[PDB]
Scaffold this active site. Structure first.
Site, PDB file in Angstrom:
ATOM      1  N   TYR A   1      48.783  34.246  41.614  1.00 40.70           N
ATOM      2  CA  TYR A   1      48.765  32.897  41.086  1.00 40.70           C
ATOM      3  C   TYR A   1      49.613  32.057  41.998  1.00 40.70           C
ATOM      4  CZ  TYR A   1      46.527  34.855  37.141  1.00 40.70           C
ATOM      5  OH  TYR A   1      45.577  35.509  36.390  1.00 40.70           O
ATOM      6  N   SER A   2      49.156  30.856  42.340  1.00 44.67           N
ATOM      7  CA  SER A   2      49.940  29.922  43.141  1.00 44.67           C
ATOM      8  C   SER A   2      51.157  29.477  42.345  1.00 44.67           C
ATOM      9  CB  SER A   2      49.118  28.672  43.487  1.00 44.67           C
ATOM     10  OG  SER A   2      47.992  28.973  44.284  1.00 44.67           O
TER      11      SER A   2
ATOM     12  N   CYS B   1      43.145  23.524  48.501  1.00 42.94           N
ATOM     13  CA  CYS B   1      43.327  24.617  47.555  1.00 42.94           C
ATOM     14  C   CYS B   1      42.351  24.534  46.389  1.00 42.94           C
ATOM     15  CB  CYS B   1      44.766  24.658  47.016  1.00 42.94           C
ATOM     16  SG  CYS B   1      45.152  26.226  46.160  1.00 42.94           S
TER      17      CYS B   1
ATOM     18  N   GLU C   1      43.475  27.605  51.102  1.00 41.49           N
ATOM     19  CA  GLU C   1      43.678  28.676  50.140  1.00 41.49           C
ATOM     20  C   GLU C   1      42.632  28.557  49.062  1.00 41.49           C
ATOM     21  OE1 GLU C   1      47.663  29.336  48.416  1.00 41.49           O
ATOM     22  OE2 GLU C   1      46.550  29.646  46.545  1.00 41.49           O
TER      23      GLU C   1
ATOM     24  N   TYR D   1      39.808  30.611  46.352  1.00 40.49           N
ATOM     25  CA  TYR D   1      39.672  31.860  45.604  1.00 40.49           C
ATOM     26  C   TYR D   1      38.632  31.660  44.528  1.00 40.49           C
ATOM     27  CZ  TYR D   1      42.922  29.050  42.840  1.00 40.49           C
ATOM     28  OH  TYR D   1      43.571  28.078  42.119  1.00 40.49           O
TER      29      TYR D   1
HETATM   30  C1  FAD Z   1      45.766  33.213  46.493  1.00 41.24           C
HETATM   31  C2  FAD Z   1      45.271  32.957  45.040  1.00 41.24           C
HETATM   32  C3  FAD Z   1      45.826  32.023  44.256  1.00 41.24           C
HETATM   33  C4  FAD Z   1      45.419  31.803  42.936  1.00 41.24           C
HETATM   34  N1  FAD Z   1      46.034  30.866  42.213  1.00 41.24           N
HETATM   35  C5  FAD Z   1      45.681  30.688  40.934  1.00 41.24           C
HETATM   36  C6  FAD Z   1      46.269  29.676  40.122  1.00 41.24           C
HETATM   37  O1  FAD Z   1      47.183  28.953  40.490  1.00 41.24           O
HETATM   38  N2  FAD Z   1      45.795  29.544  38.816  1.00 41.24           N
HETATM   39  C7  FAD Z   1      44.760  30.385  38.340  1.00 41.24           C
HETATM   40  O2  FAD Z   1      44.361  30.238  37.217  1.00 41.24           O
HETATM   41  N3  FAD Z   1      44.199  31.286  39.101  1.00 41.24           N
HETATM   42  C8  FAD Z   1      44.594  31.467  40.369  1.00 41.24           C
HETATM   43  N4  FAD Z   1      43.977  32.383  41.093  1.00 41.24           N
HETATM   44  C9  FAD Z   1      43.007  33.350  40.492  1.00 41.24           C
HETATM   45  C10 FAD Z   1      43.654  34.548  39.760  1.00 41.24           C
HETATM   46  O3  FAD Z   1      44.120  35.418  40.786  1.00 41.24           O
HETATM   47  C11 FAD Z   1      42.651  35.364  38.919  1.00 41.24           C
HETATM   48  O4  FAD Z   1      41.541  35.777  39.741  1.00 41.24           O
HETATM   49  C12 FAD Z   1      42.154  34.613  37.703  1.00 41.24           C
HETATM   50  O5  FAD Z   1      43.221  34.114  36.847  1.00 41.24           O
HETATM   51  C13 FAD Z   1      41.190  35.480  36.881  1.00 41.24           C
HETATM   52  O6  FAD Z   1      41.755  36.935  36.622  1.00 41.24           O
HETATM   53  P1  FAD Z   1      41.614  37.539  35.184  1.00 41.24           P
HETATM   54  O7  FAD Z   1      42.587  38.741  35.337  1.00 41.24           O
HETATM   55  O8  FAD Z   1      41.822  36.610  34.237  1.00 41.24           O
HETATM   56  O9  FAD Z   1      40.184  37.945  35.339  1.00 41.24           O
HETATM   57  P2  FAD Z   1      39.466  39.323  35.655  1.00 41.24           P
HETATM   58  O10 FAD Z   1      39.689  40.079  34.513  1.00 41.24           O
HETATM   59  O11 FAD Z   1      39.653  40.035  36.963  1.00 41.24           O
HETATM   60  O12 FAD Z   1      37.994  39.040  35.709  1.00 41.24           O
HETATM   61  C14 FAD Z   1      37.442  38.486  36.964  1.00 41.24           C
HETATM   62  C15 FAD Z   1      36.105  39.178  37.267  1.00 41.24           C
HETATM   63  O13 FAD Z   1      35.191  38.685  36.221  1.00 41.24           O
HETATM   64  C16 FAD Z   1      33.830  38.708  36.742  1.00 41.24           C
HETATM   65  N5  FAD Z   1      33.362  37.329  36.626  1.00 41.24           N
HETATM   66  C17 FAD Z   1      34.079  36.201  36.889  1.00 41.24           C
HETATM   67  N6  FAD Z   1      33.349  35.111  36.714  1.00 41.24           N
HETATM   68  C18 FAD Z   1      32.098  35.550  36.346  1.00 41.24           C
HETATM   69  C19 FAD Z   1      30.860  34.829  36.031  1.00 41.24           C
HETATM   70  N7  FAD Z   1      30.751  33.518  36.041  1.00 41.24           N
HETATM   71  N8  FAD Z   1      29.808  35.635  35.702  1.00 41.24           N
HETATM   72  C20 FAD Z   1      29.900  36.995  35.681  1.00 41.24           C
HETATM   73  N9  FAD Z   1      30.984  37.738  35.961  1.00 41.24           N
HETATM   74  C21 FAD Z   1      32.060  36.955  36.287  1.00 41.24           C
HETATM   75  C22 FAD Z   1      33.920  39.064  38.192  1.00 41.24           C
HETATM   76  O14 FAD Z   1      33.553  40.390  38.403  1.00 41.24           O
HETATM   77  C23 FAD Z   1      35.360  38.739  38.549  1.00 41.24           C
HETATM   78  O15 FAD Z   1      35.777  39.233  39.778  1.00 41.24           O
HETATM   79  C24 FAD Z   1      44.371  32.618  42.440  1.00 41.24           C
HETATM   80  C25 FAD Z   1      43.785  33.592  43.213  1.00 41.24           C
HETATM   81  C26 FAD Z   1      44.258  33.814  44.512  1.00 41.24           C
HETATM   82  C27 FAD Z   1      43.576  34.845  45.339  1.00 41.24           C
HETATM   83  N1  NAP Z   2      38.641  25.060  40.882  1.00 39.59           N
HETATM   84  C1  NAP Z   2      39.140  26.258  41.151  1.00 39.59           C
HETATM   85  O1  NAP Z   2      40.281  26.298  41.649  1.00 39.59           O
HETATM   86  C2  NAP Z   2      38.402  27.483  40.842  1.00 39.59           C
HETATM   87  C3  NAP Z   2      38.614  28.615  41.619  1.00 39.59           C
HETATM   88  C4  NAP Z   2      37.949  29.752  41.364  1.00 39.59           C
HETATM   89  C5  NAP Z   2      37.062  29.845  40.342  1.00 39.59           C
HETATM   90  N2  NAP Z   2      36.822  28.746  39.530  1.00 39.59           N
HETATM   91  C6  NAP Z   2      35.842  28.821  38.413  1.00 39.59           C
HETATM   92  O2  NAP Z   2      35.946  27.628  37.643  1.00 39.59           O
HETATM   93  C7  NAP Z   2      36.692  27.876  36.459  1.00 39.59           C
HETATM   94  C8  NAP Z   2      37.673  26.731  36.178  1.00 39.59           C
HETATM   95  O3  NAP Z   2      38.967  26.978  36.862  1.00 39.59           O
HETATM   96  P1  NAP Z   2      39.827  25.674  37.198  1.00 39.59           P
HETATM   97  O4  NAP Z   2      40.640  25.095  36.129  1.00 39.59           O
HETATM   98  O5  NAP Z   2      40.521  25.992  38.520  1.00 39.59           O
HETATM   99  O6  NAP Z   2      38.753  24.551  37.665  1.00 39.59           O
HETATM  100  P2  NAP Z   2      38.047  23.398  36.750  1.00 39.59           P
HETATM  101  O7  NAP Z   2      38.941  22.781  35.824  1.00 39.59           O
HETATM  102  O8  NAP Z   2      36.737  24.030  36.514  1.00 39.59           O
HETATM  103  O9  NAP Z   2      37.829  22.285  37.986  1.00 39.59           O
HETATM  104  C9  NAP Z   2      36.921  22.663  39.022  1.00 39.59           C
HETATM  105  C10 NAP Z   2      36.192  21.385  39.373  1.00 39.59           C
HETATM  106  O10 NAP Z   2      35.447  21.728  40.545  1.00 39.59           O
HETATM  107  C11 NAP Z   2      34.140  21.209  40.362  1.00 39.59           C
HETATM  108  N3  NAP Z   2      33.151  21.924  41.202  1.00 39.59           N
HETATM  109  C12 NAP Z   2      32.187  22.815  40.734  1.00 39.59           C
HETATM  110  N4  NAP Z   2      31.434  23.251  41.709  1.00 39.59           N
HETATM  111  C13 NAP Z   2      31.892  22.602  42.838  1.00 39.59           C
HETATM  112  C14 NAP Z   2      31.468  22.642  44.163  1.00 39.59           C
HETATM  113  N5  NAP Z   2      30.454  23.415  44.560  1.00 39.59           N
HETATM  114  N6  NAP Z   2      32.159  21.869  45.053  1.00 39.59           N
HETATM  115  C15 NAP Z   2      33.172  21.105  44.655  1.00 39.59           C
HETATM  116  N7  NAP Z   2      33.650  21.004  43.414  1.00 39.59           N
HETATM  117  C16 NAP Z   2      32.940  21.800  42.549  1.00 39.59           C
HETATM  118  C17 NAP Z   2      33.858  21.379  38.874  1.00 39.59           C
HETATM  119  O11 NAP Z   2      32.845  20.427  38.437  1.00 39.59           O
HETATM  120  P3  NAP Z   2      31.858  20.857  37.186  1.00 39.59           P
HETATM  121  O12 NAP Z   2      32.533  22.011  36.479  1.00 39.59           O
HETATM  122  O13 NAP Z   2      31.962  19.645  36.433  1.00 39.59           O
HETATM  123  O14 NAP Z   2      30.733  21.397  37.913  1.00 39.59           O
HETATM  124  C18 NAP Z   2      35.199  20.964  38.331  1.00 39.59           C
HETATM  125  O15 NAP Z   2      35.145  19.549  38.246  1.00 39.59           O
HETATM  126  C19 NAP Z   2      37.415  29.203  36.771  1.00 39.59           C
HETATM  127  O16 NAP Z   2      37.955  29.857  35.626  1.00 39.59           O
HETATM  128  C20 NAP Z   2      36.327  29.966  37.447  1.00 39.59           C
HETATM  129  O17 NAP Z   2      35.291  30.350  36.577  1.00 39.59           O
HETATM  130  C21 NAP Z   2      37.469  27.544  39.744  1.00 39.59           C
END
Ligand code: FAD
Ligand code: NAP
Length: 295
Positions: free
Chosen positions: A71-72, A253, A293, A295
């Site tokens: 997590y960042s 990011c 960065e 992810y």
């Molecule tokens: C460098 C870095 C920085 C990050 N910083 C942050 C941060 O600041 N805040 C934050 O919230 N997170 C951040 N993340 C992401 C964080 O590391 C986790 O990946 C995230 O919180 C989800 O992990 P979990 O343990 O909740 O999910 P998990 O239990 O691991 O589940 C994730 C897995 O669920 C499955 N999955 C996910 N989405 C779908 C979908 N749409 N359909 C089907 N299967 C799916 C995939 O197999 C996926 O890999 C960061 C990641 C990295 C690498």
């Molecule tokens: N934004 C992230 O940092 C991020 C990183 C990894 C995964 N995700 C996925 O999104 C979920 C929400 O996480 P979060 O709070 O970080 O983000 P969030 O609150 O969903 O904000 C992400 C924003 O990015 C927009 N977006 C969607 N597709 C995009 C694209 N192709 N290019 C540019 N912007 C795009 C989304 O728009 P609409 O949703 O309105 O399409 C939304 O407005 C995660 O739990 C995961 O399922 C988000």
């Protein structure tokens, strides 16, 4: 010297949750929480732009202990209270609908965190990361392109730059350059840290510019959802004008999808002036002024 890996996965620090507060106001989609941890007792040292590992409890679909998730870090080196006692995280609850069973599926680590209780103990590793560090130059221009929780390193930068008590605490860093955050979220209630981000902008108006890409309240000129790259394209020439300065750093990011459109928007602005952006960016990376960065 950048402190990295003070705690390792083999023996994490056990932090204790101080507070777990909501960031998505009513009307907003889902759950994004600001979680502050007590560091005292390990004195874990970190700087802005770095990450920590959280190892949640439990095992996986294979019987194995859960591994760390990164997590960042969302707070400056001093923590939110400016006392070097804390580290804070910005955590979105991961939940989706299973890909045709349709059952709500919860992410392990994020759901553990967003529901974690004050007084609870958490396993913390790190800090890790040397690629998202702010320059020491207080006249640097700093472009910050963020989606969602990608706001987190941008909060550590902007707080160190513009919080009153940070300036008080950092005599060696009194920022006077220009910072520009383009921040993309789905709704207005999903603007994490909105009030503070807007205090900063009225407090330091010639030093911080704040641009919103609110996905679901705004359409781009071609009738699609307003994303970060649509804002970049909109101010493509202003942005490229800053990027051409060797005092300028760019931080990206969040979603990896923002990039190719950021590259389309700037490649066009670059082209007008005879420059081809894919080579120019290759040189910004080699120079260490293109920070990514995703992810
Ligand atoms: C460098 C870095 C920085 C990050 N910083 C942050 C941060 O600041 N805040 C934050 O919230 N997170 C951040 N993340 C992401 C964080 O590391 C986790 O990946 C995230 O919180 C989800 O992990 P979990 O343990 O909740 O999910 P998990 O239990 O691991 O589940 C994730 C897995 O669920 C499955 N999955 C996910 N989405 C779908 C979908 N749409 N359909 C089907 N299967 C799916 C995939 O197999 C996926 O890999 C960061 C990641 C990295 C690498
Ligand atoms: N934004 C992230 O940092 C991020 C990183 C990894 C995964 N995700 C996925 O999104 C979920 C929400 O996480 P979060 O709070 O970080 O983000 P969030 O609150 O969903 O904000 C992400 C924003 O990015 C927009 N977006 C969607 N597709 C995009 C694209 N192709 N290019 C540019 N912007 C795009 C989304 O728009 P609409 O949703 O309105 O399409 C939304 O407005 C995660 O739990 C995961 O399922 C988000």
């Amino acid at each position: 010297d950048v402190p990295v890996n003070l705690y390792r996965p083999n023996a994490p620090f056990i932090g204790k949750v101080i507070s777990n507060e909501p960031l998505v106001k009513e009307g907003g989609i889902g759950i994004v929480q600001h979680i502050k941890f007590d560091l005292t007792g390990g004195n874990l040292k970190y700087i802005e732009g770095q990450s920590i590992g959280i190892i949640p409890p439990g095992v996986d679909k294979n019987g194995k202990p859960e591994k760390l998730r990164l997590y960042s870090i969302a707070s400056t080196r001093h923590g939110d209270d400016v006392d070097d006692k804390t580290i804070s995280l910005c955590v979105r609850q991961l939940e989706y609908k299973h890909p045709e069973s349709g059952e709500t599926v919860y992410g392990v680590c994020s759901t553990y965190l967003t529901h974690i209780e004050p007084g609870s103990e958490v396993k913390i590793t790190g800090p890790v990361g040397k690629e998202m560090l702010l320059p020491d130059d207080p006249e640097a221009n700093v472009i910050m392109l963020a989606t969602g929780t990608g706001i987190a390193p941008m909060r550590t930068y902007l707080w160190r730059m513009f919080k009153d008590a940070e300036r008080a605490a950092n005599p060696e860093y009194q920022f006077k350059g220009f910072s520009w955050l383009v921040f993309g979220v789905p709704t207005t209630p999903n603007i994490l840290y909105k009030e503070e981000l807007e205090e900063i902008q009225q407090k330091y108006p010639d030093n911080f510019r704040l641009t919103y890409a609110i996905s679901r309240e705004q359409k781009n000129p071609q009738g699609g959802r307003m994303y970060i790259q649509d804002r970049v394209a909109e101010h493509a020439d202003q942005l490229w004008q800053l990027i051409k300065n060797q005092k300028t750093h760019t931080y990206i990011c969040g979603l990896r999808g923002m990039e190719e459109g950021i590259d389309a928007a700037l490649s066009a602005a670059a082209a007008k002036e005879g420059v081809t952006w894919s080579d120019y960016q290759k040189d910004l990376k080699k120079a260490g002024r293109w920070h990514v960065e995703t992810y």
